Copies of this chain bind each other. A is one copy, B any other.
């Protein structure tokens, strides 16, 4: 009979970069 199944493959690669953060806080009072 054919042999046993092979090992699970290697982990997938790291995903793509996440989204930008949101805008920063308002600037100082004038």
Binding site for B on A (CB under 8 A): 1-30
This chain: how many copies in the complex? 3
* Complex Cα gap A18–B12 (Å): 11
* Complex Cα gap A13–B23 (Å): 23
Cα–Cα, bound, A10→B28 (Å): 46
Chain B positions within 8 Å of A27 at CB level: 23-30
Bound Cα distance from A26 to B20, whole angstroms: 12
Residues of B within 8 Å of A13, CB to CB, are: 8, 11-15
**Chain B neighbourhood of A5, CB < 8 A:** 2-10
Chain B residues with CB below 8 A from A26, complex form? 23-30
Question: In the complex, which residues of chain B have a beta carbon less than 8 angstroms from the beta carbon of A17?
Answer: 14-22
